[PDB]
Subunit: 255 residues, 2 copies
């Protein structure tokens, strides 16, 4: 509760829905005196963290965070941040976990972890391309993608990798709506037969969907206890990863 | 101030120093170990710094990423540069980069590579450019306040390469030529055998906020490239300035 902590708390009130805040609104949101808020915001301004907007005593974020964000990206890339998340989730669920990222117009699994617990596991290879309609990861990404991107993906004929793969675009749109609503996607043998997957979307600093964090398990191990333990563990790990990359969830995502 | 002191500690991080120990940070800042430790723990609690996985060293925290995204939602300069950089690199066949004023320093924060040649000028984002040794630096000084130019030129100028111009009178002469033509050129002042062209980028208040540049090897600076790079770069620079709601001052030729 020191002066450095107080100043940095003021920055937390800025979000994509509130990019400019006036001195009076900052005073009301923070609970601090106007003079305290003014003094602290002046100190943040001299450091280039905040700046006064031309019209009235309003503040917006400053340009000196840009250099620091570039160094943070260099220090911890998304796949480096995923290593601990994937390791911990694999240990908690006893199943294979993987992070897939949007690489242009496709979704590619780029990092994974195996659990120590079971000898029979869902095996992966990095740079494996996942379908948008046949994987939980793909459905999680599609559900938070632009309507035009979803339209493009569903206009193109949908390949049936397995006899269980969803080929009906109306059925995929129905599933998308359920994932949008609950913030979690499930898929049983749409990419690989006898694999039950759970996935949550990963959002970047700009609130756009980056990819998905998933738990791949054999159908034979999808017990009532696992069906109820995997979703809270995966949701928590997804939010933890989003935090390690400075991501922000869109309003349409339930928390 | 304690806020300003804490944020000065973050300035010691650069692409060559992404991890710093408490002792090295004490050495670099000039503050007592206990002061550095208290300030860094306050930054750590806020997510601005964090302890490096295995080591007992410090690195930058994820909070700066969240704040840069909000800054970019307010002033979409690096997001707008992506398309401009890509197109200019394709047109010139050379590496293009946008550098922005980060307080008192000029940092390269976005770049693009051309697919044309296998050999190119390679970069890293957050690289600090000299005001006297780069075309980008000269473009920014030429449209900076006389007091800022005076400060930069009063401090002795380091020679990064044997070609770096270290005479302040010669730099002032070059600044005047950039102010007159709206474009800066520098041959091997930052990196040997690199010929770069740069134009200033302006904000809504008509103050320079950085520079857009084309970095090429000297061996590829042909008469045709010497003719083609300046019109293409000037156009790309104007395009970027207007996208961020910027305006050129009267002293800038169009």
């Amino acid at each position: 509760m020191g002066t450095v902590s107080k100043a940095l708390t003021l920055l937390t009130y800025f979000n994509h829905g509130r990019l400019e805040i006036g001195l009076s609104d900052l005073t009301r949101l923070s609970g601090m005196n106007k003079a305290t808020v003014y003094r602290l915001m002046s100190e943040l301004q001299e450091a280039g963290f905040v700046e006064q907007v031309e019209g009235a005593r309003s503040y917006r974020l400053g340009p000196q965070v840009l250099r620091l964000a570039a160094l943070r990206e260099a220090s911890v890339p998304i796949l480096s941040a995923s290593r601990r998340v994937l390791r911990e989730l694999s240990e908690d669920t006893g199943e294979t976990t993987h992070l897939s990222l949007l690489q242009g117009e496709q979704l590619a699994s780029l990092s994974h972890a195996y659990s120590s617990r079971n000898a029979t596991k869902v095996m992966m290879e990095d740079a494996e391309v996942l379908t948008f309609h046949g994987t939980a990861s793909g459905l999680a990404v599609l559900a938070y993608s632009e309507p035009s991107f979803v339209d493009a993906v569903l206009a193109a004929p949908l390949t049936a990798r397995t006899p269980q793969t969803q080929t009906d675009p109306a059925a995929i749109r129905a599933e998308i709506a359920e994932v949008r609503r609950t913030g979690l996607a499930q898929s049983i043998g749409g990419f690989e037969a006898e694999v039950h997957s759970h996935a949550v979307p990963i959002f970047g600093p700009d609130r756009a969907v980056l990819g998905a964090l998933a738990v791949a398990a054999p159908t034979s191990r999808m017990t009532p206890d696992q069906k109820r333990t995997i979703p809270p563990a995966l949701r928590a790990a997804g939010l933890s990863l989003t935090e390690r990359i400075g991501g922000a969830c869109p309003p349409e995502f339930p928390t």
